[PDB]
Amino acid sequence: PIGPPGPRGNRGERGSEGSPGHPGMPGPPGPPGAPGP
Amino acid sequence: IGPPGPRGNRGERGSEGSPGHPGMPGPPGPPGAPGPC
Amino acid sequence: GPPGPRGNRGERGSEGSPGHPGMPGPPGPPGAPGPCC
């Protein structure tokens, strides 16, 4: 009579961390310039 | 005797990876409107 | 009946998803001084 099945294998390694996200949105237009001379 | 039993089951696959780090900040916005007279 | 062999190690988990975009960029430089009317 055949022997019992063998034990289950080990878990695979965790998947690697993902890529970084896209860079941010460009910022707001700057302040208004000072009045002229 | 008894032949050896069956090969065990395939281990469960590892857990899926983490979401990536956030991306870098976006560039500074453009210059402001030219000032008045 | 002897136990069977250990199953193979499970597969590697898949690569995690990309992260969030970066934060919006800083404001720009003040605008140029006004012209000399």
Curated annotation (Swiss-Prot), chain B:
Superkingdom classification of source: Eukaryota
Compartment list: Secreted, Extracellular space, Extracellular matrix
Modification type 4-hydroxyproline: residues: 4, 19, 22, 25, 28, 31, 34
Effect of residue 26 to D: In EDSVASC; severe variant
Modification(s) after translation: Proline residues at the third position of the tripeptide repeating unit (G-X-Y) are hydroxylated in some or all of the chains. O-linked glycan consists of a Glc-Gal disaccharide bound to the oxygen atom of a post-translationally added hydroxyl group.
Compositional bias per record (Pro residues), positions renumbered to this chain: 22-34
Effect of residue 5 to S: In spondyloepiphyseal dysplasia
Entry comment, domain topic: The C-terminal propeptide, also known as COLFI domain, have crucial roles in tissue growth and repair by controlling both the intracellular assembly of procollagen molecules and the extracellular assembly of collagen fibrils. It binds a calcium ion which is essential for its function.
Disease the record associates with this protein: Ehlers-Danlos syndrome, vascular type: A severe form of Ehlers-Danlos syndrome, a group of connective tissue disorders characterized by skin hyperextensibility, articular hypermobility, and tissue fragility. EDSVASC is an autosomal dominant disease characterized by joint and dermal manifestations as in other forms of the syndrome, and by proneness to spontaneous rupture of bowel and large arteries. The vascular complications may affect all anatomical areas.
Complex and partners: Trimers of identical alpha 1(III) chains. The chains are linked to each other by interchain disulfide bonds. Trimers are also cross-linked via hydroxylysines. Interacts with ADGRG1.
Function: Collagen type III occurs in most soft connective tissues along with type I collagen. Involved in regulation of cortical development. Is the major ligand of ADGRG1 in the developing brain and binding to ADGRG1 inhibits neuronal migration and activates the RhoA pathway by coupling ADGRG1 to GNA13 and possibly GNA12.
Family membership: Belongs to the fibrillar collagen family.
Protein name (database record): Collagen alpha-1(III) chain
Source organism (scientific name): Homo sapiens (Human)
Gene (UniProt): COL3A1
Covered range of the whole protein: 1160 to 1196 of 1466
